[PDB]
Amino acid sequence: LSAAECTLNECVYSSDFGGIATVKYSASKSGKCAVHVPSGTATLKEAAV
Amino acid sequence: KAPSLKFTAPFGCEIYTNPIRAENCAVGSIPLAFDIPDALFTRVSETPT
């Protein structure tokens, strides 16, 4: 990627996956790869987008 | 016969007959209690923003 920006649409600290973050990116190649959070701050739903 | 309560009533009431009742007396205020179930609360991202 290059020049990617993350905004939080929904944010509710519920027990399920209750938060929506829409990452506005600009990619050189169009292909799937993996997202991850290193901390224990958030737990992502899917492994790749 | 001093005139009826239809013409002399304070706050602009409207006295009627067959049940003895007054109408539309603009006085006081009605409080309200809403016990709303949790199903009606739609999430944020299902509405425009």
Q: Record the resolution, in angstroms.
A: 3.1
Give the C-alpha separation, A23 to A8, whole Å. 9
Give the C-alpha separation, A44 to A17, whole Å. 8
Give the C-alpha separation, A22 to A20, whole Å. 7
For residue B43, the chain A residues in CB contact (below 8 A) are 10
Method: cryo-EM
Q: Which residue reads 């997202």 in tokens?
A: A35
For residue B49, the chain A residues in CB contact (below 8 A) are 9
Closest CA to B27 of B5, B12, B14: B12
∠A26-A29-A33 over CA atoms, to 5°?
Answer: 90
Does residue A20 belong to the interface with chain B, where contact is any CB pair within 8 Å? yes
Closest CA to B6 of B18, B19, B21: B21
For residue A10, the chain B residues in CB contact (below 8 A) are 43-45
| Phi, psi of B8, deg, nearest 5 | -115, 5
- Is the separation of the CB atoms in B24 and B12 below 8 Å? yes
